[PDB]
Amino acid sequence: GVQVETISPGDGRTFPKRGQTCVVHYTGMLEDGKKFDSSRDRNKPFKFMLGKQEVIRGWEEGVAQMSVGQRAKLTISPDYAYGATGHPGIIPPHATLVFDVELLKLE
Amino acid sequence: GVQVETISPGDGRTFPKRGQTCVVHYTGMLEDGKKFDSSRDRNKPFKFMLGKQEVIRGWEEGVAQMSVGQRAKLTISPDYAYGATGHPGIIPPHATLVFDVELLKLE
Ligand SMILES: C=CC[C@@H]1/C=C(\C)C[C@H](C)C[C@H](OC)[C@H]2O[C@@](O)(C(=O)C(=O)N3CCCC[C@H]3C(=O)O[C@H](/C(C)=C/[C@@H]3CC[C@@H](O)[C@H](OC)C3)[C@H](C)[C@@H](O)CC1=O)[C@H](C)C[C@@H]2OC
Ligand SMILES: C=CC[C@@H]1/C=C(\C)C[C@H](C)C[C@H](OC)[C@H]2O[C@@](O)(C(=O)C(=O)N3CCCC[C@H]3C(=O)O[C@H](/C(C)=C/[C@@H]3CC[C@@H](O)[C@H](OC)C3)[C@H](C)[C@@H](O)CC1=O)[C@H](C)C[C@@H]2OC
């Protein structure tokens, strides 16, 4: 599944609704902290919508539990990410993924 | 994991080696038989290589157990396919997949 550990608190009131656009900053790492990607590096937030198979399930369920402005570490089991296959040339089979995500705004 | 059920026997001697190119025909279906894709429809075999994260794990492990000319039904658990996420607008979360695959040749 997904585990959400808070780094910095959100507003405690504005949670993402299916059909809203979430704007985030994220860093993706293996369990040992090795970084594989970050929107922070690109200087451009990542935007996505809930309820449209636009992201791995771990995110769909993890982000939904965050409130605007919150910064959290999402730990995602392989079945809620890339499972036994992984993601070609970046993530190996059966990898639990760690993402540092900041929920910037909802639009 | 993956279960391989033979429809028609292969040569019983020529099994795919990592690094060889497999040429197949396949039909992908949900567990109720509903078809989502087929190379047969396109009149063009699908080619892929073992050991390069080019296909879902269920295929990587299923095809490796087939010999040239064999026709088999591969039943693949969600973690060996698209897991809890599915594949946008085609396969739902937590779906076991059925593929009718024919191993035409190795190159
Ligand atoms: C149209 C094609 C290009 C389109 C690419 C972009 C919009 C740019 C966007 C910044 C992607 C990043 O590109 C720099 C890059 O992000 C990773 O590095 C990453 O950190 C990651 O894991 N993310 C990204 C942040 C959200 C969670 C997760 C994800 O859900 O990503 C999604 C993902 C891969 C889902 C698959 C979809 C197929 C399902 O079958 C499978 O289910 C198992 C899960 C991405 C957002 C896709 O929806 C959309 C795309 O692919 C991946 C390791 C590889 C991925 O590049 C491809
Ligand atoms: C470069 C991009 C386009 C490139 C597309 C083609 C060469 C055309 C090729 C006929 C794909 C089909 O296009 C008509 C279509 O085949 C499906 O219909 C299907 O029957 C399927 O499941 N197949 C296809 C036959 C092999 C097994 C499986 C697969 O392994 O497919 C692979 C797959 C999706 C793997 C993901 C990869 C990311 C991992 O993170 C994830 O791990 C969870 C698993 C395909 C072969 C990818 O390697 C390469 C591509 O995507 C998918 C339901 C959706 C897929 O279209 C995208």
Side-chain angles (χ1 to χ4, degrees), chain B residues 20-82:
Chain B
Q20 286 182 299
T21 298
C22 300
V23 182
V24 305
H25 266 301
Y26 73 86
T27 296
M29 295 165 278
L30 293 184
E31 266 289 327
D32 57 356
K34 289 203 292 177
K35 176 170 75 154
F36 55 87
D37 189 17
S38 172
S39 60
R40 296 187 185 90
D41 291 347
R42 291 190 286 277
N43 284 112
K44 191 178 160 76
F46 173 66
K47 303 183 203 201
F48 77 101
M49 296 198 129
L50 280 201
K52 302 199 158 189
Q53 285 169 304
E54 276 176 25
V55 285
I56 53 166
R57 197 69 188 193
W59 264 55
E60 191 76 48
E61 307 192 352
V63 177
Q65 299 175 62
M66 296 170 63
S67 51
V68 174
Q70 184 170 170
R71 185 171 179 163
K73 176 154 304 176
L74 294 198
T75 296
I76 296 164
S77 69
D79 198 67
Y80 274 66
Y82 308 101

Short mmCIF file of all heavy atoms in Angstrom, two decimals, chain B residues 20-82:
data_model
loop_
_atom_site.label_atom_id
_atom_site.label_comp_id
_atom_site.label_asym_id
_atom_site.label_seq_id
_atom_site.Cartn_x
_atom_site.Cartn_y
_atom_site.Cartn_z
N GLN B 20 17.94 -12.91 -27.13
CA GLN B 20 17.48 -13.35 -28.48
C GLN B 20 16.19 -12.52 -28.74
O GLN B 20 15.64 -12.11 -27.70
CB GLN B 20 17.09 -14.81 -28.54
CG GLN B 20 18.25 -15.78 -28.52
CD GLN B 20 17.79 -17.23 -28.64
OE1 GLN B 20 17.05 -17.73 -27.82
NE2 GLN B 20 18.26 -17.88 -29.68
N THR B 21 15.82 -12.40 -29.99
CA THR B 21 14.58 -11.67 -30.32
C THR B 21 13.46 -12.69 -30.49
O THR B 21 13.56 -13.58 -31.34
CB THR B 21 14.67 -10.74 -31.58
OG1 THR B 21 15.70 -9.73 -31.29
CG2 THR B 21 13.32 -10.16 -32.01
N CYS B 22 12.38 -12.49 -29.72
CA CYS B 22 11.23 -13.40 -29.84
C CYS B 22 10.18 -12.74 -30.75
O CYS B 22 9.85 -11.61 -30.51
CB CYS B 22 10.58 -13.62 -28.49
SG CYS B 22 11.67 -14.35 -27.23
N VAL B 23 9.63 -13.51 -31.66
CA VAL B 23 8.59 -13.03 -32.57
C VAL B 23 7.32 -13.83 -32.21
O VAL B 23 7.35 -15.07 -32.27
CB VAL B 23 8.92 -13.30 -34.05
CG1 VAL B 23 7.86 -12.74 -34.96
CG2 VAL B 23 10.34 -12.77 -34.34
N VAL B 24 6.30 -13.12 -31.85
CA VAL B 24 5.07 -13.73 -31.40
C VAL B 24 3.85 -13.05 -32.01
O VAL B 24 3.89 -11.90 -32.48
CB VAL B 24 4.95 -13.64 -29.84
CG1 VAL B 24 6.15 -14.23 -29.13
CG2 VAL B 24 4.78 -12.23 -29.30
N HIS B 25 2.78 -13.81 -31.87
CA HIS B 25 1.42 -13.32 -32.11
C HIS B 25 0.73 -13.40 -30.71
O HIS B 25 0.89 -14.42 -30.04
CB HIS B 25 0.58 -13.98 -33.19
CG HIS B 25 0.68 -13.26 -34.52
ND1 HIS B 25 0.33 -11.94 -34.68
CD2 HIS B 25 1.10 -13.73 -35.70
CE1 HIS B 25 0.52 -11.61 -35.97
NE2 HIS B 25 1.02 -12.66 -36.58
N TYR B 26 -0.06 -12.38 -30.33
CA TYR B 26 -0.73 -12.52 -29.02
C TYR B 26 -2.11 -11.87 -29.07
O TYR B 26 -2.33 -11.05 -29.99
CB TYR B 26 0.13 -11.79 -27.95
CG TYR B 26 0.08 -10.25 -28.01
CD1 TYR B 26 -0.89 -9.48 -27.39
CD2 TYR B 26 0.98 -9.59 -28.85
CE1 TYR B 26 -0.88 -8.09 -27.48
CE2 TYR B 26 1.03 -8.20 -28.91
CZ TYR B 26 0.03 -7.46 -28.27
OH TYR B 26 0.01 -6.08 -28.39
N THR B 27 -2.93 -12.32 -28.13
CA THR B 27 -4.25 -11.69 -27.96
C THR B 27 -4.27 -11.48 -26.47
O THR B 27 -4.00 -12.46 -25.72
CB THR B 27 -5.47 -12.56 -28.45
OG1 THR B 27 -5.30 -12.72 -29.91
CG2 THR B 27 -6.83 -11.88 -28.11
N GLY B 28 -4.62 -10.33 -25.97
CA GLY B 28 -4.65 -10.04 -24.50
C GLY B 28 -6.15 -9.92 -24.11
O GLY B 28 -6.86 -9.25 -24.84
N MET B 29 -6.50 -10.55 -23.04
CA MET B 29 -7.89 -10.58 -22.57
C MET B 29 -7.92 -10.47 -21.05
O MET B 29 -6.91 -10.74 -20.36
CB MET B 29 -8.45 -11.97 -22.97
CG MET B 29 -8.52 -12.13 -24.46
SD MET B 29 -8.74 -13.97 -24.66
CE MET B 29 -6.99 -14.43 -24.50
N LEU B 30 -9.09 -10.00 -20.57
CA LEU B 30 -9.34 -10.01 -19.13
C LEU B 30 -9.72 -11.45 -18.81
O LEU B 30 -9.89 -12.26 -19.72
CB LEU B 30 -10.37 -8.92 -18.80
CG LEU B 30 -9.87 -7.50 -19.01
CD1 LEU B 30 -10.95 -6.49 -18.55
CD2 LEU B 30 -8.63 -7.35 -18.10
N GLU B 31 -9.91 -11.78 -17.54
CA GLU B 31 -10.25 -13.15 -17.13
C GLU B 31 -11.58 -13.68 -17.62
O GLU B 31 -11.78 -14.92 -17.60
CB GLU B 31 -10.25 -13.32 -15.61
CG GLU B 31 -8.94 -13.81 -15.08
CD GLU B 31 -8.58 -15.23 -15.38
OE1 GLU B 31 -9.56 -15.98 -15.44
OE2 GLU B 31 -7.44 -15.64 -15.47
N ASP B 32 -12.40 -12.74 -18.05
CA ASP B 32 -13.72 -13.13 -18.60
C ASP B 32 -13.65 -13.29 -20.12
O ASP B 32 -14.76 -13.39 -20.72
CB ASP B 32 -14.82 -12.17 -18.22
CG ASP B 32 -14.55 -10.73 -18.65
OD1 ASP B 32 -13.49 -10.35 -19.20
OD2 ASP B 32 -15.50 -9.92 -18.41
N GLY B 33 -12.49 -13.17 -20.72
CA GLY B 33 -12.27 -13.32 -22.15
C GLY B 33 -12.38 -12.06 -22.98
O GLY B 33 -12.14 -12.12 -24.18
N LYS B 34 -12.80 -10.97 -22.32
CA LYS B 34 -12.91 -9.72 -23.14
C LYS B 34 -11.53 -9.30 -23.64
O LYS B 34 -10.61 -9.09 -22.83
CB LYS B 34 -13.53 -8.61 -22.30
CG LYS B 34 -15.03 -8.92 -22.07
CD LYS B 34 -15.75 -7.58 -21.76
CE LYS B 34 -15.29 -7.04 -20.38
NZ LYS B 34 -16.00 -5.71 -20.27
N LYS B 35 -11.42 -9.17 -24.94
CA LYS B 35 -10.21 -8.76 -25.65
C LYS B 35 -9.94 -7.27 -25.54
O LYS B 35 -10.85 -6.36 -25.54
CB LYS B 35 -10.27 -9.26 -27.08
CG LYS B 35 -9.15 -8.85 -28.01
CD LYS B 35 -9.21 -9.63 -29.34
CE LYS B 35 -10.33 -9.11 -30.23
NZ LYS B 35 -9.95 -9.41 -31.67
N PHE B 36 -8.71 -6.95 -25.26
CA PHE B 36 -8.26 -5.55 -25.18
C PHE B 36 -7.25 -5.26 -26.27
O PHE B 36 -7.01 -4.08 -26.50
CB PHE B 36 -7.78 -5.05 -23.84
CG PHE B 36 -6.68 -5.84 -23.19
CD1 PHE B 36 -5.35 -5.55 -23.52
CD2 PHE B 36 -6.98 -6.84 -22.26
CE1 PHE B 36 -4.32 -6.29 -22.96
CE2 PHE B 36 -5.95 -7.56 -21.65
CZ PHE B 36 -4.62 -7.28 -22.03
N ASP B 37 -6.54 -6.27 -26.80
CA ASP B 37 -5.54 -6.03 -27.86
C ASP B 37 -5.15 -7.37 -28.50
O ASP B 37 -5.32 -8.42 -27.91
CB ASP B 37 -4.28 -5.44 -27.13
CG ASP B 37 -3.18 -4.90 -28.02
OD1 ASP B 37 -3.42 -4.64 -29.21
OD2 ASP B 37 -2.03 -4.69 -27.59
N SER B 38 -4.64 -7.28 -29.72
CA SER B 38 -4.13 -8.47 -30.45
C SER B 38 -3.24 -8.04 -31.59
O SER B 38 -3.58 -7.04 -32.28
CB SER B 38 -5.37 -9.20 -30.99
OG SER B 38 -4.98 -10.25 -31.86
N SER B 39 -2.10 -8.67 -31.76
CA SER B 39 -1.22 -8.36 -32.88
C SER B 39 -1.82 -9.02 -34.13
O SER B 39 -1.52 -8.62 -35.27
CB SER B 39 0.17 -8.94 -32.55
OG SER B 39 0.03 -10.33 -32.37
N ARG B 40 -2.60 -10.07 -33.90
CA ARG B 40 -3.25 -10.82 -35.00
C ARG B 40 -4.12 -9.84 -35.77
O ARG B 40 -4.12 -9.82 -37.01
CB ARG B 40 -4.03 -12.02 -34.50
CG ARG B 40 -3.21 -13.11 -33.84
CD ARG B 40 -3.96 -14.34 -33.51
NE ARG B 40 -3.11 -15.28 -32.77
CZ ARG B 40 -3.00 -15.30 -31.44
NH1 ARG B 40 -3.75 -14.48 -30.70
NH2 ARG B 40 -2.17 -16.14 -30.81
N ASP B 41 -4.83 -8.98 -35.05
CA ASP B 41 -5.69 -7.95 -35.67
C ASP B 41 -4.94 -7.02 -36.60
O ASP B 41 -5.47 -6.59 -37.66
CB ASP B 41 -6.46 -7.18 -34.58
CG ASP B 41 -7.50 -8.07 -33.92
OD1 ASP B 41 -7.83 -9.17 -34.41
OD2 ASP B 41 -8.03 -7.63 -32.89
N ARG B 42 -3.74 -6.68 -36.25
CA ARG B 42 -2.86 -5.77 -36.98
C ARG B 42 -2.12 -6.47 -38.09
O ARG B 42 -1.43 -5.71 -38.84
CB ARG B 42 -1.78 -5.15 -36.05
CG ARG B 42 -2.33 -4.19 -35.04
CD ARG B 42 -1.24 -3.44 -34.34
NE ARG B 42 -0.52 -4.26 -33.37
CZ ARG B 42 -0.94 -4.48 -32.14
NH1 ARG B 42 -2.08 -4.04 -31.60
NH2 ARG B 42 -0.13 -5.22 -31.37
N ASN B 43 -2.18 -7.76 -38.17
CA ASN B 43 -1.49 -8.56 -39.18
C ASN B 43 0.03 -8.42 -39.09
O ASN B 43 0.73 -8.53 -40.11
CB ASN B 43 -2.05 -8.25 -40.58
CG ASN B 43 -3.41 -8.93 -40.74
OD1 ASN B 43 -4.39 -8.18 -40.81
ND2 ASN B 43 -3.42 -10.26 -40.74
N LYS B 44 0.53 -8.13 -37.91
CA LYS B 44 1.97 -7.91 -37.67
C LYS B 44 2.39 -8.50 -36.33
O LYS B 44 1.86 -8.07 -35.31
CB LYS B 44 2.21 -6.40 -37.58
CG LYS B 44 3.69 -5.98 -37.60
CD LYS B 44 3.75 -4.44 -37.55
CE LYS B 44 5.09 -3.95 -37.07
NZ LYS B 44 6.12 -4.07 -38.13
N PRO B 45 3.32 -9.44 -36.39
CA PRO B 45 3.81 -10.07 -35.14
C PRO B 45 4.52 -8.99 -34.33
O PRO B 45 5.04 -8.04 -34.92
CB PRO B 45 4.80 -11.15 -35.56
CG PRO B 45 5.02 -10.97 -37.02
CD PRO B 45 4.03 -9.94 -37.53
N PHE B 46 4.52 -9.24 -33.04
CA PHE B 46 5.17 -8.43 -32.02
C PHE B 46 6.54 -9.04 -31.73
O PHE B 46 6.68 -10.26 -31.59
CB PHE B 46 4.27 -8.37 -30.77
CG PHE B 46 4.97 -7.68 -29.61
CD1 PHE B 46 5.28 -6.32 -29.73
CD2 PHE B 46 5.29 -8.37 -28.48
CE1 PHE B 46 5.96 -5.66 -28.68
CE2 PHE B 46 5.96 -7.76 -27.43
CZ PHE B 46 6.31 -6.40 -27.54
N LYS B 47 7.57 -8.21 -31.67
CA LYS B 47 8.95 -8.68 -31.40
C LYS B 47 9.49 -8.00 -30.16
O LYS B 47 9.23 -6.81 -29.92
CB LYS B 47 9.85 -8.41 -32.57
CG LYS B 47 9.36 -9.04 -33.90
CD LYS B 47 10.50 -8.67 -34.89
CE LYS B 47 10.03 -8.66 -36.34
NZ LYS B 47 11.35 -8.82 -37.12
N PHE B 48 10.23 -8.75 -29.37
CA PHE B 48 10.78 -8.25 -28.12
C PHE B 48 11.98 -9.10 -27.73
O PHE B 48 12.16 -10.21 -28.28
CB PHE B 48 9.73 -8.10 -27.02
CG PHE B 48 9.39 -9.45 -26.42
CD1 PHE B 48 9.92 -9.83 -25.23
CD2 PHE B 48 8.56 -10.32 -27.15
CE1 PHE B 48 9.68 -11.12 -24.69
CE2 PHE B 48 8.28 -11.59 -26.66
CZ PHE B 48 8.84 -11.98 -25.44
N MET B 49 12.75 -8.53 -26.84
CA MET B 49 13.93 -9.24 -26.34
C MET B 49 13.82 -9.52 -24.85
O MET B 49 13.30 -8.68 -24.08
CB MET B 49 15.19 -8.41 -26.57
CG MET B 49 15.49 -8.17 -28.02
SD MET B 49 17.27 -7.68 -27.96
CE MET B 49 17.87 -8.83 -29.24
N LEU B 50 14.28 -10.69 -24.47
CA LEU B 50 14.32 -11.07 -23.05
C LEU B 50 15.47 -10.34 -22.34
O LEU B 50 16.53 -10.10 -22.91
CB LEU B 50 14.46 -12.57 -22.96
CG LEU B 50 13.32 -13.52 -23.10
CD1 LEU B 50 13.67 -14.86 -22.44
CD2 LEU B 50 12.09 -13.00 -22.37
N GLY B 51 15.30 -10.06 -21.09
CA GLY B 51 16.29 -9.47 -20.20
C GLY B 51 16.52 -8.01 -20.27
O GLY B 51 17.59 -7.53 -19.79
N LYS B 52 15.61 -7.25 -20.84
CA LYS B 52 15.80 -5.79 -21.00
C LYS B 52 14.64 -4.97 -20.52
O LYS B 52 14.49 -3.81 -21.01
CB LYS B 52 15.99 -5.58 -22.54
CG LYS B 52 17.21 -6.42 -23.04
CD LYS B 52 17.68 -5.87 -24.39
CE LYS B 52 19.11 -6.23 -24.70
NZ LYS B 52 19.59 -5.51 -25.90
N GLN B 53 13.79 -5.42 -19.60
CA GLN B 53 12.60 -4.71 -19.13
C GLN B 53 11.73 -4.21 -20.29
O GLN B 53 11.03 -3.18 -20.15
CB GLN B 53 12.88 -3.56 -18.15
CG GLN B 53 13.23 -4.06 -16.76
CD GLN B 53 13.76 -2.99 -15.83
OE1 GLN B 53 14.75 -2.29 -16.12
NE2 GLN B 53 13.08 -2.85 -14.68
N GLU B 54 11.73 -4.94 -21.38
CA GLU B 54 10.92 -4.61 -22.56
C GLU B 54 9.48 -5.08 -22.43
O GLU B 54 8.62 -4.71 -23.29
CB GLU B 54 11.51 -5.23 -23.83
CG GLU B 54 12.64 -4.42 -24.54
CD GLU B 54 13.25 -5.07 -25.72
OE1 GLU B 54 12.55 -5.89 -26.33
OE2 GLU B 54 14.40 -4.89 -26.12
N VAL B 55 9.18 -5.97 -21.49
CA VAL B 55 7.79 -6.45 -21.35
C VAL B 55 7.51 -6.68 -19.85
O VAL B 55 8.41 -6.69 -19.02
CB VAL B 55 7.53 -7.79 -22.11
CG1 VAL B 55 7.43 -7.59 -23.61
CG2 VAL B 55 8.62 -8.80 -21.76
N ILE B 56 6.22 -6.78 -19.56
CA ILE B 56 5.83 -7.06 -18.15
C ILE B 56 6.47 -8.41 -17.78
O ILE B 56 6.67 -9.35 -18.59
CB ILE B 56 4.27 -7.10 -18.00
CG1 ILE B 56 3.65 -8.08 -19.03
CG2 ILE B 56 3.61 -5.70 -18.08
CD1 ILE B 56 2.16 -8.43 -18.71
N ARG B 57 6.80 -8.50 -16.49
CA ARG B 57 7.49 -9.69 -15.94
C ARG B 57 6.79 -11.00 -16.25
O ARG B 57 7.47 -12.06 -16.36
CB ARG B 57 7.72 -9.55 -14.44
CG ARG B 57 8.75 -10.49 -13.83
CD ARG B 57 10.12 -10.06 -14.33
NE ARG B 57 11.14 -11.02 -13.95
CZ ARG B 57 12.45 -10.77 -14.06
NH1 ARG B 57 12.89 -9.63 -14.58
NH2 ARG B 57 13.32 -11.65 -13.59
N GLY B 58 5.48 -11.00 -16.26
CA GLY B 58 4.68 -12.21 -16.49
C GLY B 58 5.07 -12.77 -17.85
O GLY B 58 5.13 -14.02 -17.98
N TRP B 59 5.33 -11.91 -18.81
CA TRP B 59 5.72 -12.35 -20.16
C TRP B 59 7.17 -12.88 -20.16
O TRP B 59 7.52 -13.86 -20.79
CB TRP B 59 5.63 -11.22 -21.21
CG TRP B 59 4.41 -11.18 -21.99
CD1 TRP B 59 3.11 -11.11 -21.47
CD2 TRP B 59 4.25 -11.20 -23.42
NE1 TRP B 59 2.20 -11.11 -22.49
CE2 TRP B 59 2.86 -11.21 -23.69
CE3 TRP B 59 5.18 -11.21 -24.47
CZ2 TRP B 59 2.39 -11.15 -25.00
CZ3 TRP B 59 4.70 -11.27 -25.75
CH2 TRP B 59 3.33 -11.23 -26.01
N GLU B 60 8.01 -12.11 -19.52
CA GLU B 60 9.47 -12.44 -19.40
C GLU B 60 9.61 -13.84 -18.84
O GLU B 60 10.43 -14.67 -19.37
CB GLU B 60 10.05 -11.38 -18.50
CG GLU B 60 11.50 -11.15 -18.28
CD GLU B 60 12.30 -10.44 -19.34
OE1 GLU B 60 11.80 -9.42 -19.79
OE2 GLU B 60 13.40 -10.89 -19.66
N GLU B 61 8.81 -14.17 -17.84
CA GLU B 61 8.90 -15.50 -17.26
C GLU B 61 8.05 -16.52 -17.97
O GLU B 61 8.51 -17.67 -17.95
CB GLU B 61 8.60 -15.46 -15.78
CG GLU B 61 9.46 -14.43 -15.06
CD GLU B 61 9.47 -14.48 -13.57
OE1 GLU B 61 8.65 -15.28 -13.07
OE2 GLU B 61 10.25 -13.72 -12.98
N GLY B 62 6.94 -16.14 -18.58
CA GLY B 62 6.06 -17.07 -19.26
C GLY B 62 6.64 -17.54 -20.60
O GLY B 62 6.57 -18.70 -20.95
N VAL B 63 7.08 -16.59 -21.43
CA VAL B 63 7.63 -16.89 -22.75
C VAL B 63 8.88 -17.75 -22.66
O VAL B 63 9.13 -18.57 -23.55
CB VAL B 63 7.78 -15.65 -23.64
CG1 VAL B 63 8.43 -15.98 -24.98
CG2 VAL B 63 6.44 -14.94 -23.80
N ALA B 64 9.70 -17.49 -21.62
CA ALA B 64 10.91 -18.26 -21.42
C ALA B 64 10.60 -19.74 -21.27
O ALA B 64 11.58 -20.52 -21.44
CB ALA B 64 11.74 -17.72 -20.24
N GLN B 65 9.41 -20.16 -20.91
CA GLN B 65 9.05 -21.56 -20.73
C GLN B 65 8.37 -22.14 -21.96
O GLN B 65 7.81 -23.29 -21.84
CB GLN B 65 8.07 -21.71 -19.53
CG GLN B 65 8.70 -21.23 -18.23
CD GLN B 65 7.69 -21.26 -17.11
OE1 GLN B 65 7.20 -22.35 -16.78
NE2 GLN B 65 7.37 -20.12 -16.53
N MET B 66 8.42 -21.42 -23.07
CA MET B 66 7.74 -21.93 -24.28
C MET B 66 8.84 -22.31 -25.31
O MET B 66 9.87 -21.63 -25.27
CB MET B 66 6.78 -20.90 -24.92
CG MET B 66 5.64 -20.55 -24.02
SD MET B 66 4.71 -19.12 -24.68
CE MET B 66 4.06 -19.74 -26.23
N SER B 67 8.54 -23.24 -26.15
CA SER B 67 9.50 -23.61 -27.21
C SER B 67 8.92 -23.14 -28.55
O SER B 67 7.69 -22.87 -28.70
CB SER B 67 9.84 -25.08 -27.26
OG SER B 67 8.70 -25.91 -27.29
N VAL B 68 9.82 -22.96 -29.50
CA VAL B 68 9.38 -22.48 -30.83
C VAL B 68 8.21 -23.22 -31.44
O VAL B 68 8.20 -24.48 -31.45
CB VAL B 68 10.60 -22.33 -31.76
CG1 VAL B 68 10.17 -21.96 -33.19
CG2 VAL B 68 11.50 -21.22 -31.20
N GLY B 69 7.16 -22.52 -31.85
CA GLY B 69 5.94 -23.05 -32.44
C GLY B 69 4.84 -23.31 -31.44
O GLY B 69 3.67 -23.58 -31.83
N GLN B 70 5.15 -23.22 -30.17
CA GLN B 70 4.16 -23.48 -29.13
C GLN B 70 3.11 -22.33 -29.07
O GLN B 70 3.47 -21.17 -29.35
CB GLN B 70 4.80 -23.56 -27.77
CG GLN B 70 3.82 -23.94 -26.62
CD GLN B 70 4.66 -24.21 -25.43
OE1 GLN B 70 4.22 -24.37 -24.24
NE2 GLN B 70 5.99 -24.35 -25.56
N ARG B 71 1.92 -22.76 -28.78
CA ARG B 71 0.81 -21.80 -28.58
C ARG B 71 0.35 -22.01 -27.15
O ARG B 71 0.02 -23.17 -26.80
CB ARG B 71 -0.30 -21.90 -29.61
CG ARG B 71 -1.35 -20.75 -29.39
CD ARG B 71 -2.29 -20.82 -30.60
NE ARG B 71 -3.29 -19.76 -30.38
CZ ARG B 71 -4.06 -19.32 -31.38
NH1 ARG B 71 -4.09 -19.93 -32.58
NH2 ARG B 71 -4.88 -18.27 -31.24
N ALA B 72 0.30 -20.99 -26.31
CA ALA B 72 -0.06 -21.18 -24.89
C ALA B 72 -0.84 -19.99 -24.38
O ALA B 72 -0.82 -18.94 -24.97
CB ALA B 72 1.21 -21.31 -24.03
N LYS B 73 -1.57 -20.27 -23.32
CA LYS B 73 -2.35 -19.24 -22.58
C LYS B 73 -1.49 -18.90 -21.38
O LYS B 73 -1.11 -19.80 -20.57
CB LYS B 73 -3.67 -19.91 -22.20
CG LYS B 73 -4.62 -19.10 -21.36
CD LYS B 73 -6.07 -19.58 -21.60
CE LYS B 73 -6.43 -19.53 -23.07
NZ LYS B 73 -7.78 -20.09 -23.29
N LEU B 74 -1.10 -17.65 -21.23
CA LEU B 74 -0.33 -17.18 -20.08
C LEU B 74 -1.32 -16.48 -19.10
O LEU B 74 -1.95 -15.54 -19.62
CB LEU B 74 0.69 -16.15 -20.57
CG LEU B 74 1.83 -16.51 -21.49
CD1 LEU B 74 2.93 -15.46 -21.49
CD2 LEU B 74 2.40 -17.82 -21.08
N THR B 75 -1.45 -16.92 -17.91
CA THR B 75 -2.35 -16.22 -16.93
C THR B 75 -1.35 -15.53 -16.00
O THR B 75 -0.53 -16.19 -15.35
CB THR B 75 -3.26 -17.25 -16.17
OG1 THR B 75 -4.11 -17.87 -17.19
CG2 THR B 75 -4.13 -16.49 -15.15
N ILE B 76 -1.56 -14.20 -15.93
CA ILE B 76 -0.58 -13.38 -15.17
C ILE B 76 -1.25 -12.61 -14.03
O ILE B 76 -2.19 -11.87 -14.34
CB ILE B 76 0.09 -12.43 -16.20
CG1 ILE B 76 0.93 -13.23 -17.29
CG2 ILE B 76 1.06 -11.41 -15.53
CD1 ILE B 76 1.19 -12.23 -18.48
N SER B 77 -0.64 -12.76 -12.88
CA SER B 77 -1.20 -12.02 -11.65
C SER B 77 -0.86 -10.57 -11.80
O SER B 77 0.08 -10.14 -12.52
CB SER B 77 -0.61 -12.67 -10.42
OG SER B 77 0.77 -12.42 -10.31
N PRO B 78 -1.63 -9.67 -11.12
CA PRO B 78 -1.47 -8.26 -11.28
C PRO B 78 -0.07 -7.76 -11.01
O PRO B 78 0.45 -6.90 -11.75
CB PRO B 78 -2.53 -7.65 -10.30
CG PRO B 78 -3.54 -8.71 -10.11
CD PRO B 78 -2.74 -10.04 -10.23
N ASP B 79 0.60 -8.30 -10.00
CA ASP B 79 1.97 -7.79 -9.70
C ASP B 79 2.95 -8.11 -10.86
O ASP B 79 4.01 -7.46 -10.85
CB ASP B 79 2.42 -8.21 -8.33
CG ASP B 79 3.63 -7.32 -7.85
OD1 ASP B 79 3.33 -6.11 -7.63
OD2 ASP B 79 4.74 -7.82 -7.69
N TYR B 80 2.58 -9.09 -11.65
CA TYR B 80 3.47 -9.47 -12.78
C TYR B 80 3.02 -8.79 -14.06
O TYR B 80 3.51 -9.08 -15.18
CB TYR B 80 3.56 -11.00 -12.92
CG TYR B 80 4.65 -11.59 -12.03
CD1 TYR B 80 4.46 -11.49 -10.65
CD2 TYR B 80 5.85 -12.04 -12.49
CE1 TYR B 80 5.41 -11.92 -9.74
CE2 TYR B 80 6.84 -12.51 -11.61
CZ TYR B 80 6.60 -12.45 -10.25
OH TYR B 80 7.52 -12.87 -9.30
N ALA B 81 2.08 -7.89 -13.89
CA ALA B 81 1.50 -7.07 -14.98
C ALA B 81 1.40 -5.62 -14.51
O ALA B 81 2.39 -4.98 -14.19
CB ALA B 81 0.14 -7.64 -15.43
N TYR B 82 0.19 -5.05 -14.45
CA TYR B 82 -0.04 -3.63 -14.11
C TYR B 82 -0.48 -3.32 -12.71
O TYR B 82 -0.74 -2.11 -12.41
CB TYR B 82 -0.95 -2.94 -15.19
CG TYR B 82 -0.35 -3.19 -16.57
CD1 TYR B 82 -0.90 -4.18 -17.40
CD2 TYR B 82 0.74 -2.46 -17.03
CE1 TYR B 82 -0.34 -4.42 -18.66
CE2 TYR B 82 1.29 -2.68 -18.28
CZ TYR B 82 0.74 -3.69 -19.08
OH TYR B 82 1.27 -3.97 -20.32
#
